[PDB]
Structures are given as structure tokens and as C-alpha cells.
């Protein structure tokens, strides 16, 4: 017999870090881990924007230049 019950590439539905405990905040919090894609912080809705011309403004999402990445005790 065998089984064929495997996620291939992990399971972005029901792992949630495959359950992690140990250190709560003591090795990064849930909020340190910045978006890869962040909304454009140079742009800020033009003074020239008109929501009756085009609708509500959104920024583009761009790559985070600063992306904290590896948490460390510092």
C-alpha cells in the first residue's frame, strides 16, 4: 500500500508556518515582515487628481527597496 497525500510545495491554505511557537516576539513579530510589494511612497495622489474625471486614486504597488528581511537581535 501507499498514500498520495502530500502538498508538493507546502500548503498555502492550512499550514500557517506549519505551526510555530517558541519565542512570541523574541525572534521577529508578525509585523516586522514587510510586504515585498508596497504602495508607492513617492506618489501621494496628484494635486491634479480628479475623482470625477477618473475615479479614486490608487498608487502603484512597487517593490519595497528597504524590506527588513532577516530579523536579528539588534
Asked how this structure was determined, the answer is NMR
- Separation CA 36–CA 59 (nearest Å): 15
d(CA 37, CA 17): 20
* 3 vs 7: CA distance, rounded Å: 12
Taking the C-alpha atoms of residue 24 and residue 38, their distance in angstroms, rounded to an integer, is 25
40 grid coordinates: 508607492
Distance between CA atoms of 18 and 9, rounded to whole angstroms?
13
Q: Distance (Å, rounded) from C-alpha 70 to C-alpha 23?
A: 16
Q: Which domains, and CATH codes, for the chain?
A: 1-74 (2.10.250.10)
- Please tell me the distance from the alpha carbon of residue 36 to that of residue 39, in angstroms, as a whole number: 10
Contact 32, 71 (CB under 8 A): yes
The rounded distance, in Å, linking the Cα atoms of 67 and 32 is 9
Amino acid at each position: 500500500s501507499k498514500k498520495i497525500k502530500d502538498p508538493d510545495a507546502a500548503k498555502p491554505e492550512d499550514w500557517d508556518e506549519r505551526a510555530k511557537i517558541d519565542d512570541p516576539t523574541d525572534s521577529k513579530p508578525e509585523d516586522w515582515d514587510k510586504p515585498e510589494h508596497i504602495p508607492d511612497p513617492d506618489a501621494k495622489k496628484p494635486e491634479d487628481w480628479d475623482e470625477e474625471m477618473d475615479g479614486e486614486w490608487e498608487p502603484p504597488v512597487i517593490q519595497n527597496p528597504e524590506y527588513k528581511g532577516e530579523w536579528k537581535p539588534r
